[PDB]
Amino acid sequence: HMGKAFKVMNELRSKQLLCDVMIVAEDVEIEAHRVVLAACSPYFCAMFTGDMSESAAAAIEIKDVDGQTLSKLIDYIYTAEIEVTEENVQVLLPAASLLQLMDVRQNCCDFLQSQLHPTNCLGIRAFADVHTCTDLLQQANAYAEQHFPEVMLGEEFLSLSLDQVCSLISSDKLTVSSEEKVFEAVISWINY
Amino acid sequence: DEKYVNSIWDLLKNAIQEIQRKNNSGLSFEELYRNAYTMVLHKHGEKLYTGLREVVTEHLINKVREDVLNSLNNNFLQTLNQAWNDHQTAMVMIRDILMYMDRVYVQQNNVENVYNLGLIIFRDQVVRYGCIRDHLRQTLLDMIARERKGEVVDRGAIRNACQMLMILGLEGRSVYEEDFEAPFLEMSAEFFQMESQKFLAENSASVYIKKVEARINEEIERVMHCLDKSTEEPIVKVVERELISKHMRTIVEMENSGLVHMLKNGKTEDLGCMYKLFSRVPNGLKTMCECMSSYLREQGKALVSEDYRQGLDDLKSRFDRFLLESFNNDRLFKQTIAGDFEYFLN
């Protein structure tokens, strides 16, 4: 019953009927129904039912989300399903987490964990750490076993930024085949 | 960075304090939520939490508590409840703009989520401050006592207060239980004993029992009208304890009133009421059974010494009428009757 209700809601949006709000990102202007957005998301719900100026605004803009992504996610809100790949996944997870669509955040997380490779690591441990997906942190560090690169340990330190200069040897778990990693790195790290 | 999160934070603080002044309309939601979002995204969530706690705490300590402190001697309840309302309304928005931290950050650090934290601050800093606390307890208890003495009281206020305590329990009755329900039960018990002595002194057993039933009903109505539903079971337990259970033998043994007098004159309705009442507490039916047993035994044994079978069959008839109509054909009563007979037929 509700499935078909959404299926026709989609049509009504695309026919631009009963649309009480326009949301704009950068390029795109998306007409939609306030109550559907409010229903599918806590962000939009708190925005439209709130006592804050946005609720009195017929038009509105959200940032830190690219246009195409926003379109894709409103389309998700209406269609209940979504497409996720390696190109979009990392612009998908933070953007969905912003609008408080959690099932999508979970999607992107699962997709990230699925593709884990000896080289992969990297952003997957960083992203999680910044995007506060904890299961992904645990999964990624439990995935750290005897990597021994100069090159992709390069990947390890490179995207973990500054706080990792702490957490590198702050982690007592590290046991290395070649003990050089403390010196050769630093000057090079200082070189760059 | 060092200075980025601070520059965001002063904005967030100004916004929160703004929300606490009820000028919130005109604040951009998207902006505030975004700022909080990025601050959490930078792993500064702890600072955001701490700042939240300090802003809220300062607001409830320096203004609201003082607001309800100056209101002690006029419209105290209305003022406190108004404060509770305003606090709730503010914490709704404060939660909404901090929503990102609320959903994600607070879980893994094991800290109270935004709204419940607000509830904790309001509880500790206002309701539990101890002038407000004592005056609140005394206010509610006094109002209830007055209503018991026949005066009219405002039940809306009481209902709101009890509800507030229930909420401050954080999905529990604990603060409502210890701050209100317990002394309420103590006071109620005292008053009930006080009335029980009066009724037992100047009345018969039947009207006393009727008055105990009526008492129970009034107290239940008080529970659903004012207090929390959960207080229904405890208070009736008190009514039953004070009026019935402490006095059981006194009730049944009343001269020209109680059980033996009802048996002699064959009052079926009164025996029904007594049975129904005493079935509520432990040892009640056993008390009735024991007094009855004694009576039936002394009478039957007095009969065995100096036709015969017609007297006995009529007695049997009588007590079977009792057992059936009054005693609800109870097993215990049957066994005690047959016990009496099997005793004095020998």
Author numbering:
A (entry chain A): 32 to 223
B (entry chain B): 26 to 331, 340 to 379
Copy the relevant paper text.
While many CRL complexes interact with bipartite substrate adaptor proteins, such as the Skp1/F-Box adaptor protein complexes in CRL1, CRL3s differ by forming a complex with single-chain substrate adapters that bind directly to both the cullin and substrate. Many of the known CRL3 substrate adapters belong to the BTB-BACK-Kelch family of proteins. These proteins are made almost entirely of three concatenated structural domains: the BTB and BACK domains form the platform that engages the N-terminal region of Cul3, while the Kelch repeat domain forms a β-propeller structure for substrate binding. Notable proteins from this family include Keap1 (KLHL19), an electrophile-sensing regulator of Nrf2, KLHL9, which is associated with an autosomal distal myopathy, KLHL12, a regulator of the dopamine D4 receptor Dishevelled and CPOII coat function, KLHL20, a regulator of hypoxia-inducible factors, and KLHL3, a regulator of hypertension with mutations identified in pseudohypoaldosteronism type II (PHAII).
The structure of human KLHL3BTB-BACK/Cul3NTD complex reveals a 2∶2 complex, with two chains of Cul3NTD bound independently to two equivalent and non-overlapping surfaces of a KLHL3BTB-BACK homodimer. The Cul3NTD chains are positioned to form a cup enclosing the space where the substrate-binding Kelch domains of KLHL3 are predicted to be located. The structure of the BTB domain of KLHL3 resembles previously solved long-form BTB domains, and consists of a three-stranded β-sheet flanked by seven α-helices. The strand-exchanged interchain β-sheet involving an N-terminal “β1″ strand has been observed in many long-form BTB domain dimers, but is not present in the KLHL3 dimer. The KLHL3 BACK domain spans residues 150–276 and is expected to consist four sets of helical hairpins, however only the first 5 helices (two and one half hairpins) could be reliably modeled into the electron density maps. The Cul3 binding interface on KLHL3 consists mostly of surfaces in the BTB domain, with important contributions from the BACK domain. Overall, the KLHL3BTB-BACK/Cul3NTD binding interface consists of 25 residues from KLHL3 and 26 residues from Cul3, and collectively bury 1066 Å2 of surface area. Cul3 binding induces an ordering of this region between α3 and β4, including the formation of α3.1, in all three BTB/Cul3 complexes. Several hypertension disease mutations in KLHL3 map to the Cul3-binding region and disrupt complex formation.
